[PDB]
């Protein structure tokens, strides 16, 4: 059931489907003919998102799905200074 995020350099980033559906872009790429070829996992490919930032994207997916509408005070996402801008380019493209 978990989707299959693939980075630019071939790293596999299996994350829960409900976690990846928090981003509208993956919501689009999984739909359409992306849902025509289905196996035990849903494969989505990012040819220009490096692994060091797609890992943080998946971390944000987990962080966002766990802290959705929770009364506990939410700490900020710890974005490293070296990977900020790239993640900012990964956040717009993924609409997350």
């Amino acid at each position: 059931m978990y989707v299959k995020l693939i980075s630019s350099d071939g790293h596999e980033f299996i994350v829960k489907r409900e976690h990846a559906l928090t981003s509208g872009t993956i919501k689009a790429m999984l739909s359409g003919p992306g849902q025509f070829a289905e196996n035990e996992t849903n494969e989505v490919n990012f040819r220009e998102i490096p692994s060091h930032v797609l890992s943080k994207v998946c971390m944000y997916f987990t962080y966002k799905v766990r802290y959705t509408n929770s009364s506990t005070e939410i700490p900020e996402f710890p974005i490293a200074p070296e990977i900020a801008l790239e993640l900012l380019m990964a956040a717009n493209f993924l609409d997350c």
Partner: protein, 107 residues
């Protein structure tokens, strides 16, 4: 590569997009990796240096959709006495293709 603005040529990327966009509509099969890479092509056209090609992409997508609907119209109108069933099949194909297209052109 990277998710940065690049000096991209609109013609080659648009042709790679066209080969897939003509098959997204009318429920033709495309490769899942190809469908995933077309999203990167859409993004690259929308962030191209020195001017965004989103205006050109929008104009060419509208032109392609108009041309496809006119071709489909000349395919359905010339066959009378069965325009209802042919229209139904065409509308089912075009509706699912248009939903998948709005998924593709989401950026």
């Amino acid at each position: 590569t990277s998710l940065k603005p690049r000096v991209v040529d609109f013609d080659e990327t648009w042709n790679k997009l066209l080969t897939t966009i003509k098959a997204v509509v009318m429920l033709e099969y495309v490769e899942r990796a190809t469908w995933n890479d077309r999203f990167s092509d859409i993004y690259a056209l929308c962030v191209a240096y020195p001017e965004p090609l989103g205006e050109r992409l929008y104009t060419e997508t509208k032109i392609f959709l108009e041309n496809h609907v006119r071709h489909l119209h000349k395919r359905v109108l010339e066959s009378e006495e069965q325009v209802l069933v042919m229209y139904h099949r065409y509308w089912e194909e075009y509706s699912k293709g248009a939903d998948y297209m709005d998924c593709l052109y989401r950026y």
